[PDB]
Write an enzyme that holds these catalytic residues in place. Sequence first.
Site, PDB file in Angstrom:
ATOM      1  N   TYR A 140      24.859  -7.912  27.482  1.00 46.05           N
ATOM      2  CA  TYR A 140      24.204  -8.487  26.301  1.00 46.05           C
ATOM      3  C   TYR A 140      25.133  -9.529  25.675  1.00 46.05           C
ATOM      4  CZ  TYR A 140      20.351  -5.185  26.135  1.00 46.05           C
ATOM      5  OH  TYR A 140      19.201  -4.462  26.409  1.00 46.05           O
TER       6      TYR A 140
ATOM      7  N   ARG B 131      19.940   3.672  32.769  1.00 48.36           N
ATOM      8  CA  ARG B 131      19.550   2.261  32.814  1.00 48.36           C
ATOM      9  C   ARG B 131      20.658   1.402  32.224  1.00 48.36           C
ATOM     10  NH1 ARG B 131      15.329  -0.974  28.812  1.00 48.36           N
ATOM     11  NH2 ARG B 131      15.780  -3.063  29.645  1.00 48.36           N
TER      12      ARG B 131
ATOM     13  N   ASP C 240       7.658  -8.929  20.500  1.00 51.93           N
ATOM     14  CA  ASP C 240       9.012  -8.364  20.518  1.00 51.93           C
ATOM     15  C   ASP C 240       9.949  -9.333  19.818  1.00 51.93           C
ATOM     16  OD1 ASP C 240      10.903  -6.454  21.091  1.00 51.93           O
ATOM     17  OD2 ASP C 240      11.376  -7.278  23.059  1.00 51.93           O
TER      18      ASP C 240
ATOM     19  N   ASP D 282       5.586  -3.946  20.440  1.00 48.49           N
ATOM     20  CA  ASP D 282       6.283  -3.153  21.450  1.00 48.49           C
ATOM     21  C   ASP D 282       6.580  -1.714  21.057  1.00 48.49           C
ATOM     22  OD1 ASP D 282       8.607  -3.371  19.851  1.00 48.49           O
ATOM     23  OD2 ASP D 282       9.933  -3.744  21.607  1.00 48.49           O
TER      24      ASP D 282
ATOM     25  N   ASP E 182      13.880  -5.845  16.506  1.00 47.90           N
ATOM     26  CA  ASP E 182      15.184  -6.007  17.153  1.00 47.90           C
ATOM     27  C   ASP E 182      15.995  -7.101  16.490  1.00 47.90           C
ATOM     28  OD1 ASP E 182      14.598  -4.140  19.169  1.00 47.90           O
ATOM     29  OD2 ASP E 182      13.302  -5.620  20.170  1.00 47.90           O
TER      30      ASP E 182
END
Lengths: 275, 283
Positions: free
Chosen positions: B89, B78, B152, B115, B120
Amino acid sequence: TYTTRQIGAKNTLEYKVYIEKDGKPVSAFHDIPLYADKENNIFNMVVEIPRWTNAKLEITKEETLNPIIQDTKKGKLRFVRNCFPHHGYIHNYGAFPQTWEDPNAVGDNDPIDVLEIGETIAYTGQVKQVKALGIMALLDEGETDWKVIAIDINDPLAPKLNDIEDVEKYFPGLLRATNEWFRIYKIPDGKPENQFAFSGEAKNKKYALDIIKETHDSWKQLIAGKSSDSKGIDLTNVTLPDTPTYSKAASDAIPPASLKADAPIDKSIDKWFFI
Amino acid sequence: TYTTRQIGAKNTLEYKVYIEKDGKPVSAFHDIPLYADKENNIFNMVVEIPRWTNAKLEITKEETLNPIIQDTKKGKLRFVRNCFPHHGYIHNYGAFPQTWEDPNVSHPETKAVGDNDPIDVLEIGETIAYTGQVKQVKALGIMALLDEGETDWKVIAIDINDPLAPKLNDIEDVEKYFPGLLRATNEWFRIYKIPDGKPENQFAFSGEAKNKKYALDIIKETHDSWKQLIAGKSSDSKGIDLTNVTLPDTPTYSKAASDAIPPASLKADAPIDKSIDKWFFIS
Ligand SMILES: [Mg+2]
Ligand SMILES: [Mg+2]
Ligand SMILES: [Mg+2]
Ligand SMILES: [Mg+2]
Ligand SMILES: [Mg+2]
């Protein structure tokens, strides 16, 4: 078949990339035909700078067979800085061979510049076949620095792209990013914002072809030894037998391919500038 | 000192990166302290994905000592696609260790379950990070992403070694020194999976980046959730491997686990399919 020959390590002063035809170095400026298919206006583009890279690589007019090398100023290698929201160059960036903006607004003294907008990231010294979609005119201190907008004919979208309005349809915002990028890309270097002619408008394919053809005619005069001033330009070529500067031996004089890994790039080049 | 142990070539299915201390693997999820300096709120960030890259590298929850491995879909590697005007990113991307977005409760700020991952972290400094790096960061603010309907949160942070770190102390400073970055961040997390055939995401608070105080509160919540998880007291630990080599009061402590990890077998990065170059124009 066109391939490349690298001398030196990438990201050093010694780095040079020559284009080879069937294994033999040729001039990247003079020996690569402008047209892959003249009747259908398919051009050969020489790629200098891959999308999303920083090193300012260019065909050098003054070295024999006109390899691609990194630009320097006062002995220092030159990079474009990252200008938010952009990362390096935002196009596969290069030029059309066998073109020259004759400086004798005024010609910019180089092969006409080309922005190739397709999906695949190109490699330095790549010869790809492209169609012209339109053209912008960046001003550089009174010189008309044309930027041809083109696409690789092998791009999945190439059949759907024929003129400048198609760039707006399939790549919405790319023209605006292009305008912004060329306006601001030297600001981190301590230079002013640049300006475009035509209020930043991209002229259409017809218009672009006229300009490209003019710069090809200028190159024809140049390589024939008939320009008013070719000072600083090496016209050595290995494929045009009736030009004064034909010399097949020039191909044999080029060193063999380098045995070297990329040199590291200073971490400062990572920096994102908000300007 | 933290280092990395790489198995295989980057951009292959065999690639793994373990975080080492003293040349021996530790759990990237459980064994790296959340705080480098608790009293001054300096956090350890585990970096997964360097800025301007695509491979979706992540701490692997279900693997012993939780090495970083590339995510897959149908068994294929992926990569996040390039979404114009962005390249991969747009932050150094990773997580705070010893945190968990609890999937077993609805979070009141978003009205959605967590999540199931560590919280994150978006690290905004100039230098591009490396996978498996442990860096020390200050929290500046936080955004309440709903990623495919799940809570998230994204912590906005900066490496304490960044030249600008001393001038960045709360979220308003990010807009001052990185004008447009927060707006681009909102766009990025909204659209980044549209090329994968997923819907646009959304944010709570209309995408507002809440401040440092808010961020610290949510970070604490997720640390508390992890403390329950690692104690074996979650109502559902979702098959997460809780093996650790530094937390003796936990049921799954095992110094031995480190010795079972194969030696480094670092290979040159493997090529990436040219399709990943593609720039997607979403509107
Ligand atoms: Mg040029
Ligand atoms: Mg030019
Ligand atoms: Mg995931
Ligand atoms: Mg995560
Ligand atoms: Mg998450």
